Amino acid sequence: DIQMTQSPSSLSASVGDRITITCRASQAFDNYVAWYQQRPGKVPKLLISAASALHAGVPSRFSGSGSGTHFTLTISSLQPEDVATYYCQNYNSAPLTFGGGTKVEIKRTVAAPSVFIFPPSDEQLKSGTASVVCLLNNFYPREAKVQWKVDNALQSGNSQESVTEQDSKDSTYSLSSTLTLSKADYEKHKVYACEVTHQGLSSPVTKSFNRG
C-alpha cells in the first residue's frame, strides 16, 4: 500500500467501447482500493470502494475487480460523460496514496487541424517583447508536431505549447504554440513559420508571415 501506480497514463476509445484501467500496488493490503473520477475542471468524486463496490450515482457500466496488488477498473460502454481522470487509492492502510491517474478520452475519426498564425501586436513590441502565436484548431488525435522556423532555421527552447481539454461537442482538441523573443531579436529576422505535422495531414502544413 506504500506505492500506487496506474496504467496507462492515457487511453482512447469510441463511445460504446469497453476499457480497463489498471492500478498496481507495491504491497498487499487486504484489497482496500478506491477509485475516483475527476471530470475536467471539476472536483474528484468517489466511484468505487472495496475494489468492486459501486457508489451512489455511478452507472452499472462501471466495474472494478482484482486482488492482492493487481487492481482494475472497467467501463463497459464508454460515454462522453465518462471523459475524466481516474485515480486509484489505497485506504484503511498507511500511507494513504493515490495512483498517478489515468486520463480517459473519447476516440473519434481523424481530423486535421486548421492552422492560424498571429504576429506580435505593435502594442507588445512597444514593451520590448514579441510573441508569435501558432494556433491548431479542432483536431484529432491530440498528438501533433509543431515546429517553429525563423528564416528557415529550426527553433528550440523558446516556445511553449498549451492544449485544451477534449471538446464536449466534437471530441476534438485545440493547441497553441507561442514563440517568445525579445523585440530586438524579432526585428532581426523576416520570415516566421509554424510547421505542423499531424495524422490528418498527408504533408505538413506551414503557416508563415513576413515581418512587416
Next chain:
Amino acid sequence: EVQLVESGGGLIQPGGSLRLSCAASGFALRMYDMHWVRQTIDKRLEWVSAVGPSGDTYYADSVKGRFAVSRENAKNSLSLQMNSLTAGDTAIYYCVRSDRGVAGLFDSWGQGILVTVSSASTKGPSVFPLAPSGGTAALGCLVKDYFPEPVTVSWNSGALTSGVHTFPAVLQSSGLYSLSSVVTVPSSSLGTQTYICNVNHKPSNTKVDKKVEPK
C-alpha cells in the same frame, strides 16, 4: 446535503504562513474524520492531513512538522495552519469528509481552494490582440505575464461562446503565467462585427477589455 466550503487561501511567500478554513454543513463534524487532500501542479492527488472528532491529528510526511490541523466540532468547522511553506506546497487544497467507519475513504469533497507559494509579487496581465488575417477566421487575445492564477477571459462579455477556446495557462521561465484565448468566426463578419476579449485578474485587481481589430 453535504457542503464543504474552503476559505483562506491565496498567494504567500516561501517560509510564510496561511490558514485554510472549511465550513461544513449537511452533517455533524463530530461523527466523521476530516481530511485535507491536495492536487499539485502535476495534477497528482496527495493526502495531506487528518483530524478526528476528539482532536487526534495526522500528517503526511511531506508536511509533518510544518502543518497543524484542528477542528471545532461546535462550529462544524475545520482548519489547516500551513507554515514554513515552499513552492512545492502550491496546489488546490480540498476539505474532505471520510466515510464514517472507514479510514481514508473520501466520499465528500469541498470545492477546492488555490494556494500558491512563490517569491514572485502579484502582477496584472498585459493583454495583446491576436489579430485575424476564406469562410472561417481566427482571432484572439494574448494574456501575458501575470501572477498568480487565475485569470478569467470572456468574449463580448459572455455573449460570444461558440468556437471559443481559452487555453490553460503556462508558467514561463520568468515565473509568470501566460495564456491565449481564441475564437473562430465567419471571415465575412470581420470589419463589421466587434470582438472584445474581457480579461479579469482578481488577485491584482486588473481588468482589461481589449478590442481585437482585423489585420
